[PDB]
Amino acid sequence: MNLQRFPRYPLTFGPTPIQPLARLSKHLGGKVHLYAKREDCNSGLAFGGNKTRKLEYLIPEALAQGCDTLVSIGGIQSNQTRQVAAVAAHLGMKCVLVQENWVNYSDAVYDRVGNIQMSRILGADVRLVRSWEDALESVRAAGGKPYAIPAGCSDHPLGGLGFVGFAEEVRAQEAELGFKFDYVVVCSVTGSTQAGMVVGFAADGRADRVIGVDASAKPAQTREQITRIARQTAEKVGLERDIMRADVVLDERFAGPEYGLPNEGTLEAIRLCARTEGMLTDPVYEGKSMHGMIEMVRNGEFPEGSRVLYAHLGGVPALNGYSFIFRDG
Amino acid sequence: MNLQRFPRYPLTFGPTPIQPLARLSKHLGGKVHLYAKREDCNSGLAFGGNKTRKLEYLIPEALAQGCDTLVSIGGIQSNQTRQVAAVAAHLGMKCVLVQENWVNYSDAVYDRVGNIQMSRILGADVRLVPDRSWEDALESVRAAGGKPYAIPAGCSDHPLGGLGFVGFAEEVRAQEAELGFKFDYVVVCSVTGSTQAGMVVGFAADGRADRVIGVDASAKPAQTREQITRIARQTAEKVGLERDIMRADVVLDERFAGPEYGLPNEGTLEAIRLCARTEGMLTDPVYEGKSMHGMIEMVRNGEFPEGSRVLYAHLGGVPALNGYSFIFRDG
Amino acid sequence: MNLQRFPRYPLTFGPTPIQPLARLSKHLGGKVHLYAKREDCNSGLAFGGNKTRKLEYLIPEALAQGCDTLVSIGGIQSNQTRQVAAVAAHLGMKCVLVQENWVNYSDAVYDRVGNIQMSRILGADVRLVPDGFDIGFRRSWEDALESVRAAGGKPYAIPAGCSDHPLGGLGFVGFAEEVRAQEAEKFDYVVVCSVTGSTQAGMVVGFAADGRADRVIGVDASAKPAQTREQITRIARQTAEKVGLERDIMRADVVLDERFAGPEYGLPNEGTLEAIRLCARTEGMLTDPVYEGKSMHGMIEMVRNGEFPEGSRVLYAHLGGVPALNGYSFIFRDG
Amino acid sequence: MNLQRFPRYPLTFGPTPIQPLARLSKHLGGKVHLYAKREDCNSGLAFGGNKTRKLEYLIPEALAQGCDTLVSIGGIQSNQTRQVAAVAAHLGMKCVLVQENWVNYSDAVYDRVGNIQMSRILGADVRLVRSWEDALESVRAAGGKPYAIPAGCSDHPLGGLGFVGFAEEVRAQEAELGFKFDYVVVCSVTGSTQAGMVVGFAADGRADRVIGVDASAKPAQTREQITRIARQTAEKVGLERDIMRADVVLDERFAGPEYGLPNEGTLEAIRLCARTEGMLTDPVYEGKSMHGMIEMVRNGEFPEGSRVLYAHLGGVPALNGYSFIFRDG
Ligand SMILES: *Cc1c(COP(=O)(O)O)cnc(C)c1O
Ligand SMILES: *Cc1c(COP(=O)(O)O)cnc(C)c1O
Ligand SMILES: *Cc1c(COP(=O)(O)O)cnc(C)c1O
Ligand SMILES: *Cc1c(COP(=O)(O)O)cnc(C)c1O
């Protein structure tokens, strides 16, 4: 394959570090070696995260197209939209965000802290709710040229490129470390994060080692999205193989009870990981993927000796919209 | 000098990047070149920030002395205590935090979002003073069978609390080497003081101590200024500074600290917005927004020599934004 | 029957007013006439409400016993504990409230606004436990009673909602009495929200006396109808006997509709919300997402479905609870 | 005088009750007998309060004029705008409310709980920010006829009538009681509440017995508004005398530090009163007037044996916007 053909606009500090999770690994049995690749610390643009890695491959097209406004969408505590707002500010672009009520969660400061708060400070036009088209049209009619960024950046032709690059990065780091990771655990919702990974790791025969953990609570849709995006992306980068259902692993046991709502396992997972490693995760995405990984290790689902690379996608600021749940820890 | 004599426990990713703030520089007239060194992105331990750089030089002693608990203190939205809680969890140590109402602010979720929320999740025993806390805290640890390592407010008034930022100057020299030039100034927010102190000592070396432009955020200029001065002299001695720190070496502008510690003024808010909107870089209403406000005003007043290169030290503090949600409800 | 036998301490202004809900009645077609008996406005003690009417019959006992502390229990936005705190302060008694989140809900300011905020201002010792403590399991209720004694005082034990208490059903028997006296100026049905039960129970006993027990249409807000229904019946029978009601309470006398309790105790459904908004926008009368909004939703839905004979006059008992709206601010952010 | 010349629209349950504050009185030495007149429990329309007594005299005119929309104004936690929204709903009229932040305060849920929450639920169109004028115009432009209701109902020709009636009510109740109150404590900010009282008690020679307690923190301006409204109202009811400045008593010692902000004395008084009587007061209005009365009795400013009638004007729902302050009581 060949990713290098597509330009990448630097929005990150560079390759993201991989850290050992020795305390947590030991706590769980010392049988499985856990690591974490910090996508959550990839940028100076309002905390970045996985969405920011994706955006690097989309910005060039926005610039090439002479666009002046970035328009995106997501739930109230969307990480995607907060990142688009920061990238836009940094690029000197206007920003219009469509924020919808995507979660059955009632919290007094939900639309005023965390991710959405930053987007407003960053100068984005935050619209709280077809709304998609309206917003875009709004921009054209306003005299500007919008660059449409779908939810999570996922269902877009360039949306899968960022994480194919992730697999690339990991290969280079395994070469520096002198060892390979047996698996990768990643949280999945809109899909192009895992899709990129699947294509990237299909290259060296480990697509099936990319263990996705669903956090959408609609596993069938998410799995089809990932699969579809992986196929389109595999074509885009010249993978010399088709993606098979066997290449898309999506665990469904940890997404409940709903998207945006933690279960008690989620909370326990967030607490354990934070208290053993000092590494925070959130109740919507990462805490669920962290939950899955801990559970898998606990159930012995990982062969003894396995090295598991947890991909920390970001999302911590959303913790602010769930303050009551953590009031005592 | 020789900071190398003191061990440094790795708590950061490595040197912190310097980024140009061209959009903001141009916005202010394009006469002064603004940069930012990102201490606020130095670690994977609950966002880190300047305190985490300070802590790298304290943990070895704490470990050497066999302590099993880190004990610290600060206001409700203290960045310090949150970093202590994360560093403790990472090191396998317990943590006790004494949090006091240091600000005349009373937001509905002030004690449940941002920094303090993270400390609780990180497993610290977060103690809210009513409404000697410090001694009870330390003693409770002994009484329980542990050994506490005491970390004073901001890590500042501690024998080792000024080291972290001497190394910051060391870091900046090596980056200037690749940059092919030296920054004319450094802007840093100051409250407990060992951050600006370390910098004062670090830059005294190549005679730029008075180029480190401190911006007071304590709203108690005199005390803070005095503490920086003292911490500097002590640290200077600790590292072998072949020169002495003169009062003239400690620079602290007091025009941007109002109205009180922990409360922003309208300038602070505008500054936070201007910078976030021109660079995608956030600052808080208690600390960085005030030093950012200082720098912009300085540039605006033509107080920087045309052509000057100014290095803004972004110390962190962003999670505290969550405690001032009403002020930013519309931006 | 004779309630006059049991002493009643004044904690209310006097009988509660009945007002017509003419606008809401008209909006629903005008075929049924709705009114409201404002139990929610019965007292100067921190907004009072139904619980305060119940307390009038318990306090004489607490006083005769020489108790100096009132001890009660309830969820975070419990109306009962807030009224106990004000009654206590008013009487010069101390107050301990054992509390815990009894709802699968987690609003940012849930434990610091509305009802619980007032209890703390009122001087009560609000003992709110962290999630997973489980007071009902550890029997924290008793330790609290014990700690008062252990401390030198004498506690008067007031159970959840005052209901499952010997004198807990008297207040609302008196309500039926008061209604009769006001009718001497008759309502066909009464709509009342039911959770812990002695409110509707007292009504059942009180109205059984003039043959209207089955005219009290209870609307479950517990989302545990079977338990609640049984509680109402039992409290009724005990209270009937207590007030010498020369009659047995039939299973037929206790009416508890289960259609508007969803999805859970303390959680409103879209129906609850529309009902709160409709009643508020037509009569200027506010109801809450936990209790009254569900019974308001009940009455409106019943009238809408024609379960009420044309021409019927329905007396909606507004038991109170409005302060709890403060804990559901996000839901009403745009109205 | 002749108050009866004006039509009063019923919006209350009827005369408000007078309760003794026996415990608070004994607590402060029992040398002064304190009582409370509960204007705060005067209506089933969203808790009511003094504003509702004022409004009973303005509504007939709004109706007579055929207006279909009530338009008013106040700060975020304004009690007035909440009562206006409830009266509108009850009357079947539309409601437009201009809310501005009149307080240097910024609590996270300030514009979502208490009074303003009720107004939105009651169906008012709550517009947060020439303010006033724009609102009024927009209603006409929509094809409606708005009835303008100034802040607190105070600078309105009819705004002072409600409390002239309050004095009426009190003489009548004093008859039944068989005794007279020597003083009346009342919180004053916009002014027509105390002005109505001044006029109503001028009739029996007790105008200077109406002890006003400033809560505006701008006493000179408030003292002048009460004076003016009182004179204009006395003329409108045919008082057989002109109102003199000496008829207006306004203590300025308890308004600090600013309108909308409590001082430590305010909080203490709110707590003492709540804990001795079970009667709540707020940090903006009543707690300051409660603070005043207690301080007056404590300093021996009332003659031994005096009977003081505290007018509790309402305002308790605003407590919700000061939750941090009362988190532990
Ligand atoms: C968007 C997001 C995810 C899921 O990534 P997808 O590419 O949408 O599947 C996981 N974690 C965080 C923190 C995210 O913002
Ligand atoms: C502690 C802190 C400061 C001030 O540093 P001192 O060493 O205490 O002077 C500035 N900004 C942030 C974000 C901080 O946490
Ligand atoms: C307690 C309560 C109810 C239910 O009354 P029970 O006697 O417990 O059945 C209804 N509404 C409100 C406002 C309440 O506080
Ligand atoms: C408006 C108000 C006041 C002050 O009354 P004015 O007539 O404006 O002086 C006092 N208390 C409460 C509760 C109020 O709403």
Principal-axis shape of chain A: globular
Give the bound compounds. pyridoxal-5'-phosphate
The CATH class of the largest domain in chain A turns out to be Alpha Beta
N-to-C SSE string of chain A, H for helix and E for strand: EHEHEHEHEHEHEHEHEHHE
Kindly report the CATH topology of the largest domain in chain A: Rossmann fold
CATH architecture of the largest domain in chain A: 3-Layer(aba) Sandwich
User: What is the count of distinct domains of chain A?
Assistant: 2
Keywords (chain B): Hydrolase, Pyridoxal phosphate
Protein name (chain B): 1-aminocyclopropane-1-carboxylate deaminase
Pfam families (chain B): PALP
Active site (chain B): 78
Please provide a written account of the structure.
4 copies of one chain form a homotetramer. Chain A is of the alpha/beta class and 329 residues long. Chain A folds into 2 domains: 219 residues, 3-Layer(aba) Sandwich (Rossmann fold), CATH 3.40.50.1100; 90 residues, Rossmann fold. Chain A is 39% helix and 15% strand. Chain A is built from 10 helices and 10 strands. The first copy, chain A, has a 6-stranded mixed sheet. In chain A, strands 5-4-3-6 form a 4-stranded parallel sheet, with helices on both faces. In chain A, strand 3, helix 3 and strand 4 form a beta-alpha-beta unit. The longest helix of chain A is centred in the C-terminal third of the chain and has 18 residues. In chain A, 64% of the residues are buried. At the A-B interface, helix 3, helix 4 and helix 9 of A face helix 4, helix 5 and helix 10 of B. The site of one pyridoxal-5'-phosphate has 20 residues of chain D, from helix 2, helix 4, strand 7 and helix 8. One pyridoxal-5'-phosphate binds next to helix 2, helix 4, strand 7 and helix 9 of chain C. Chain B: Homotrimer. Chain B: Keywords: Hydrolase, Pyridoxal phosphate.
